[PDB]
Design a protein around this ligand. Structure first.
Ligand SMILES: Nc1ncnc2c1ncn2[C@@H]1O[C@H](COP(=O)(O)OP(=O)(O)O)[C@@H](O)[C@H]1O
Ligand SMILES: Nc1ncnc2c1ncn2[C@@H]1O[C@H](COP(=O)(O)OP(=O)(O)O)[C@@H](O)[C@H]1O
Ligand SMILES: [Mg+2]
Ligand SMILES: [Mg+2]
Lengths: 349, 349
């Protein structure tokens, strides 16, 4: 039989993955040590595993470790702080996320002889830099995952010539739109994906040729490293302590709940910080537009379709529209632009 | 008669020896024939005599037989078999290996009448069984050594009152910690010494009395024959045929090369067995602690300090930590633990 295919993303906000059979999972990039759950099972019936990932993972010692990951880790008081999370792609923090991303996206009772084309991702300026670090991790990733309170296990191990690395935004606009953007690309134009992520924002362009095929440019395209949603959480963390004036600083959930809405429910009251949320987004909108003119001279006028991506692009699509209005548009899945872009451009082999 | 002192060992993995002047040598217990080293002499400087032991050996019938021994014999393909080596202490192998480190540690400018006190060792359980045979052999010893490529020779012959017979691990914590553990030993405790050698594993304890004197317990102390580093080399060798997936097999030099590192360079590329190296070393460490507690019931609670000896325990110390944490510890010279213990406790005469 043919080899299976899974395209995941190790993005800093949330793991965004999809398989060969077009089933997708999404959960935030927070881990926590798992503790025994049969009690909270009894109060509320679990119909979603994604909310409730209690899970055991074997290792090279074949020693299991309980984990809370995803939505269940965010409610825990003892989880990862998630603002000082490592960029080391071979870390166990990245392993458990990658274990669950490969754990959910495998259906039951597959033949054990076949292997899976896994397709991961890297930052654009850190693709070459962190190429062999994930190559070492995926060669080292020999683990057996066991979902507690769902009771289905996967033996996840990969040899050589099965992993496939791509940069972020590589196949999201090269592929994934090529069947639909081919009528829009005409002659010597630039398409551009702008993925607004957690830690970084990512700019990738593709010149199409005379023969209507896109080709890459790296001096018009880079990673806005350290510029992204991370500037919004850190600013709005100070915005609460400026508005509380008590020394009360938000925890992991309260800050993440804040920048989605702007009204944290503090002491039986919503503390209004909608205006400072606009200001932190506008400074992020400042630091992507002015950096775009650093990468683009008059070639911003040489665009036919700007696309913006990322979950951070969802709340900023009309706000980051001021790059080139009436030409920029939204990618059809704002979160899953990279993953399906990894899927279609991973099936080219 | 200011008689000299040299303390040696008969370790199967390698020979460990030291003189009165604390000059110490270490070399593997591998022999081969001696062939004329004049061609390589002009190429590379034969400088380290311990690395390059081409040695001329006479007997009582003046039968000169050159031998490559040690590191150079390990480089030879036609070397001693050494993984199924005969355990006869009166072997010609042991005739060479004992006479090897003598002239390598017999100093210059000795008086005419002055002899040398030699201190040797036996396995602890076989110290009753094999006391006669080494005493047969040391009385037998009447030879003459000569060093090719370094241009000096020694006379070598001994009688009784020059011989000294203490078992393996006997004087290592009797002396060598004697005035140092005296502040640690207080009242009615045991001290732990475990020799993790190549072929054999020794366990030896000492009850200290009310009078701060160590006394020996033969029933809490035994030689674990068949347990040691020789299991790990033999385990990973079949594992090398596994991960190569071709039935190809190492040589004797690659055998000792492997489980010092675990990443053997084979057919233009590394072959990775690092997982199984962690597996087998933890597996042997499991087998030590259980057989340690085979002799140790609740008398493990009557310990105050455990030391480990042998070359294996130095690289097992993280996994041999699980006997009693922060009470178990590593001796400073894991190889020369028996040697200095043979030295000072051999200096009774
Ligand atoms: N509905 C929403 N409201 C507010 N912010 C959102 C929403 N959806 C996503 N986000 C933001 O987008 C980020 C997700 O970015 P993502 O596309 O996963 O990039 P990365 O690949 O860097 O993780 C989150 O950290 C979150 O702050
Ligand atoms: N640096 C090292 N790395 C791996 N193994 C080692 C190292 N040093 C010593 N050893 C192991 O320890 C053994 C030496 O044990 P040793 O103390 O000489 O006991 P014996 O008296 O039985 O020969 C060797 O066979 C070797 O496998
Ligand atoms: Mg992203
Ligand atoms: Mg020994």
């Amino acid at each position: 039989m043919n080899k299976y295919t899974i395209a995941i993303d190790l993005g800093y906000g949330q793991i965004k993955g999809i398989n060969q059979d077009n089933k997708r999972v999404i959960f935030p990039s927070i881990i926590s040590s798992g503790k025994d759950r049969s009690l909270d099972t009894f109060f509320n019936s679990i119909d979603n595993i994604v909310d409730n990932i209690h899970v055991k993972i074997l290792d090279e010692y074949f020693n299991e470790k309980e984990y809370f990951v995803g939505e269940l880790a965010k409610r825990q008081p003892s989880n990862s702080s998630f603002i000082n999370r490592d960029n080391k792609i071979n870390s166990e923090e990245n392993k458990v996320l990658l274990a669950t991303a490969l754990g959910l996206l495998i259906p039951n009772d597959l033949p054990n002889d076949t292997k899976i084309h896994i397709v991961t991702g890297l930052p654009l300026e850190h693709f070459i830099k962190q190429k062999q670090a994930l190559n070492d991790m995926l060669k080292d990733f020999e683990h057996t995952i066991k979902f507690v309170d769902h009771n289905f296990s996967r033996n996840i191990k990969f040899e050589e010539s099965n992993i496939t690395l791509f940069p972020q935004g590589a196949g999201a606009i090269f592929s994934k739109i090529n069947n639909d953007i081919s009528s829009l690309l005409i002659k010597e134009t630039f398409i551009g994906l702008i993925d607004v992520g957690f830690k970084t924002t990512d700019i990738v362009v593709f010149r199409i040729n005379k023969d209507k095929e896109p080709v890459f440019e790296q001096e018009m395209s880079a990673t806005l490293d350290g510029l992204g949603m991370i500037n919004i959480y850190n600013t709005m963390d100070k915005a609460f302590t400026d508005n509380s004036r008590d020394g009360s600083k938000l925890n992991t959930e309260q800050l993440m709940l804040l920048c989605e809405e702007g009204k944290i429910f503090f002491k039986g009251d919503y503390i209004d910080l909608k205006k400072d949320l606009i200001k932190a987004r506008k400074t992020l909108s400042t630091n992507i537009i002015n950096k775009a003119d650093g990468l683009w001279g008059s070639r911003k006028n040489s665009f036919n379709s700007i696309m913006i991506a990322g979950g951070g692009g969802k709340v900023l699509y009309n706000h980051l529209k001021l790059i080139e209005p009436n030409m920029c548009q939204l990618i059809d899945n704002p979160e899953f632009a990279n993953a399906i872009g990894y899927l279609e451009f991973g099936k080219q082999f």
